[PDB]
């Protein structure tokens, strides 16, 4: 995702025998990450019926 940084700078000495100069603007970047996970588990059977509960 992008962004626009705000302006800054001096004013100037407003004066003759010379002219002004305009100025500019910049831009910028931003990132992120996707991640993903999972697991599992299991059992036997014979044990289940022999143990008295599930």
């Amino acid at each position: 995702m992008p962004y626009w940084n705000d302006l800054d700078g001096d004013s100037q000495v407003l004066n003759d025998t010379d002219d002004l100069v305009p100025q500019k603007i910049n831009a910028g970047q931003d990132k992120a990450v996707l991640i993903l996970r999972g697991n599992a588990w299991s059992s036997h059977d014979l044990a289940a019926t022999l143990s008295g509960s599930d």
Binding site: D45, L46, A48, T49
Partner: protein, 54 residues
């Protein structure tokens, strides 16, 4: 009358017969249960089907 009983053999081709004499009527047994007493599965990339008892 049953054809299957333990029968042994010594050398010189002599035989020994067992012949349980019980006449009891009886001792005892019971069926009981597992879980999943019967099931069916198959292999899709092949062609198969199965049975189980346990």
């Amino acid at each position: 009358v049953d054809d299957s009983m333990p029968v042994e053999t010594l050398e010189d081709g002599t035989k020994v017969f067992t012949s349980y004499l019980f006449g009891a009527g009886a001792l005892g047994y019971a069926e009981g249960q597992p879980e999943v007493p019967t099931e069916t599965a198959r292999n899709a990339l092949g062609s198969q089907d199965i049975l189980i008892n346990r």
